[PDB]
Design a protein around this ligand. Structure first.
Ligand code: SAM
Length: 182
């Protein structure tokens, strides 16, 4: 694995079992690429499309589509470039599993870092809503804090179920199952 972050995705998929055959999968904040590697392993003899997005250029991985871009900036609809690159890949399809291991640099003021994390989470969520397939899974990392539950409740407005994982500036994942729309 290119990063020890791979083991976080292994843990997530072991518990929540979302990596399945015949799914289109997007990995946001993919650099240097270990989640992409885990996704490849777990879907080894399956038909899938695996897409990675990061503002940093990732070294290519065979059978993974990479898109350089900052979600919240390089996609057009926020609170063209990423969108048109997705269009090339997806055509008329939406994305079954959207994962985000993205994070904003810490300034060393806990509350500000949490608010910044909220802002990033909202940007990624706004982008997710455009591209997620009905029935799709969305998992997003954030710094746990005062607004986490607000965000969880917001997500419960568009998914059948939303779970907060165990904290690990502590970080959690919001695991969202079965996109239903608003
Ligand atoms: C911890 S790294 C991800 C490690 C990755 N999951 C792996 O296993 O190789 C977090 C990444 O999020 C990216 N990132 C932060 N904000 C982003 C954004 N708005 N859009 C795309 N990527 C972003 C960073 O550039 C960074 O590479």
């Amino acid at each position: 694995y290119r990063s020890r972050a791979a083991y976080k995705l292994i843990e997530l998929d072991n518990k929540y079992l979302f990596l399945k055959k015949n799914k289109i999968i997007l990995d946001i904040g993919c650099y240097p690429g270990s989640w992409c590697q885990v996704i490849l392993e777990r879907t080894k003899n399956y038909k899938n499309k695996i897409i990675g997005i990061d503002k940093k250029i990732m070294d290519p991985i065979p059978n993974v589509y990479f898109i350089q871009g900052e979600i919240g900036k390089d996609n057009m609809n926020n609170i063209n470039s990423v969108d048109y690159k997705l269009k090339e890949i997806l055509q008329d399809k939406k994305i079954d599993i959207i994962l985000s291991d993205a994070a904003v640099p810490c300034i060393g003021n806990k509350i500000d870092d949490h608010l910044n994390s909220c802002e990033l989470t909202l940007s990624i969520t706004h982008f997710m809503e455009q591209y997620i397939n009905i029935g799709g899974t969305y998992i997003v990392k954030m710094y746990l804090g005062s607004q986490t539950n607000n965000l969880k409740t917001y997500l419960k407005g568009m998914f059948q179920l939303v779970h907060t994982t165990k904290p690990k500036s502590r970080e959690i994942y919001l695991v969202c199952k079965n996109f239903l729309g608003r």
